[PDB]
Write a protein that binds this ligand. Structure first.
Ligand SMILES: *[C@H](CC(=O)OC)[C@@H](C[C@@H]1CCNC1=O)NC(=O)[C@H](CC(C)C)NC(=O)OCc1ccccc1
Ligand SMILES: *[C@H](CC(=O)OC)[C@@H](C[C@@H]1CCNC1=O)NC(=O)[C@H](CC(C)C)NC(=O)OCc1ccccc1
Lengths: 306, 306
């Protein structure tokens, strides 16, 4: 038993991380097939990033201005193109370690694993959730751009994130693998505001179902409620509105534990109106919202990957 | 910036995970060079595990009674030996993916990364700390034995843990890679008690230094204290006694933030005597003790691995 936040095995992604250098700027790149993906601001200096005209900046750059290093071996760049906020460097060698991969654009509330890299070398892996305001709360130092977020079905790597920015608030913003930013963010060193960060309600309920599975029981109360009544209290505490869909994905955990979703919603209702009273749930003194209803089943059914 | 609990890249360990079957029992094995390491209770049935005589049980087993599977390829076992609570299966093929590796026995309070596996296939990775009572709080379902814990310097994998048991309390116990259990535990399905779980004081102080680095400041107070005075209050809250050694490892974070260790100890002293008042530090409403003083520097200096 036991419940922890768990990142996917990063072995398949490690084989695709390369170092990309342009001028004096160095970041990480994603080498899939014969294409290297990296943030387009690799063509930017520190002064360029204040107000960059990426088109005018990319005009001055050629193929030989891009040094792609895979450990100690170099990839000869034979073409480059700017797709939105990402750069696609065509190399003359296909990556022999390319797994079966996809490019997906996740939805708010869904989670993924981040392989933090510097100089194209992995440093650590952790689980991140795309907040409803399309930010993430990760760990990114200088040189961490180009690092990717991903999910794995069994042998298929679903790339979904690439890191670009840290906002003035300390949270992080990025794009998908097509260069499109998550949220209303642009890759420019200027003050940028995300919306009000709300709580992924279906995720806290799934995390409460996991605690119920793992022996944490004190929170289980005796009330029930309705979908609109709970949403009136959920909107009071900046929680996402629970839809009939969210009830359907939680069905698996509800049908196994025998607690109706509206019953769990009532136990969550009192948990917001009365606090934790100095108690903990699964070793945390607050409500966790970074566990999707599929992340708990993944940890209770024991799925694997090859 | 930002601070998260981070697991090492598990790519090098994934290449050493194989499936080990004996009779009807299947668990994970560690394939390094031409030796496969796995818990010795692979020779046990469900009824054997109540009171096993491992010697008498291993007498009945031969080399061909051990099926070692690496994906779809089998490893021919040509020898077996019981070292403490671990089984060493000699195969006729050296693992071509063996990294530079060591076998170490960690100290209480130190952390490591756990690659959770089932049927020799990785499932997830998370960071664990060896509690002062020589247990860990992980996530282990049925079939998770043989999974290992490890640390990486740069290209050297330091294996330190192998999973065996879940206690009646829900926490987990295991051995090093030499078969010696951490703590007073034996691999037998019987009621077994760990001691009183105490808090790794040097780890909470290092985690407070990280919050100080990442903008979390409200806890910083104005008192100071002495080593004995703080230990009198630390022992009151079941905290490990802080030694002059612990002050020396915290020197790096103390000399960078400019807060003396005894000053941080006073801010921690009031944090125990006054609680958090419904506030959070680094997104947690309690004091984290699973971050060693080297784990914060690892996340603030940005070390990498190859
Ligand atoms: C990407 C550049 C890189 O890593 O390698 C060239 C980022 C820096 C990362 C983002 C998270 N922390 C970092 O150090 N460089 C940037 O200039 C971007 C903005 C756009 C050009 C994408 N991020 C940014 O300006 O972040 C502000 C910041 C806050 C705290 C610390 C460093 C930067
Ligand atoms: C190892 C066996 C295995 O995984 O594959 C053969 C363990 C089961 C693991 C330990 C953590 N959770 C599991 O399911 N089998 C055991 O019998 C051991 C005891 C010794 C023989 C090592 N663990 C044990 O008895 O755990 C009790 C338990 C609690 C909760 C759920 C399952 C088992």
């Amino acid at each position: 038993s036991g419940f922890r936040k768990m990142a996917f095995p990063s072995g398949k992604v490690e084989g695709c991380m390369v170092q990309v250098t342009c001028g004096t700027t160095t970041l990480n790149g994603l080498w899939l097939d014969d294409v290297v993906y990296c943030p387009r601001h690799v063509i930017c200096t520190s002064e360029d990033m204040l107000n960059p005209n990426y088109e005018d900046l990319l005009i001055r750059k050629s193929n030989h201005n891009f040094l792609v290093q895979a450990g100690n071996v170099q990839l000869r760049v034979i073409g480059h193109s700017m797709q939105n906020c990402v750069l696609k460097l065509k190399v003359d060698t296909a990556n022999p370690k390319t797994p079966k991969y996809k490019f997906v654009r996740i939805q708010p509330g869904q989670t993924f694993s981040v392989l933090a890299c510097y100089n194209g070398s992995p440093s650590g892996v952790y689980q991140c959730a795309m907040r409803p305001n399309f930010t993430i709360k990760g760990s990114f130092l200088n040189g961490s751009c180009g690092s990717v977020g991903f999910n794995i079905d069994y042998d298929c790597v679903s790339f979904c994130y690439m890191h670009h920015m840290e906002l003035p608030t300390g949270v992080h913003a990025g794009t998908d693998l097509e260069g499109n930013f998550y949220g209303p963010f642009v890759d420019r060193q200027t003050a940028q505001a995300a919306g009000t960060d709300t709580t992924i309600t279906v995720n806290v309920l799934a995390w409460l179902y996991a605690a119920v599975i793992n022996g944490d029981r004190w929170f289980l109360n005796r009330f029930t409620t309705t979908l609109n009544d709970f949403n009136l209290v959920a909107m009071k505490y900046n929680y996402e509105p629970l839809t009939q869909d969210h009830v359907d994905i939680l069905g698996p955990l509800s049908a196994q534990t025998g607690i109706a979703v509206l019953d769990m919603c009532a136990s969550l209702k009192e948990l917001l109106q009365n606090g934790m009273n100095g108690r903990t749930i699964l070793g945390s003194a607050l409500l966790e919202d970074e566990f999707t209803p599929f992340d708990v089943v993944r940890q209770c059914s024991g799925v694997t990957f090859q």
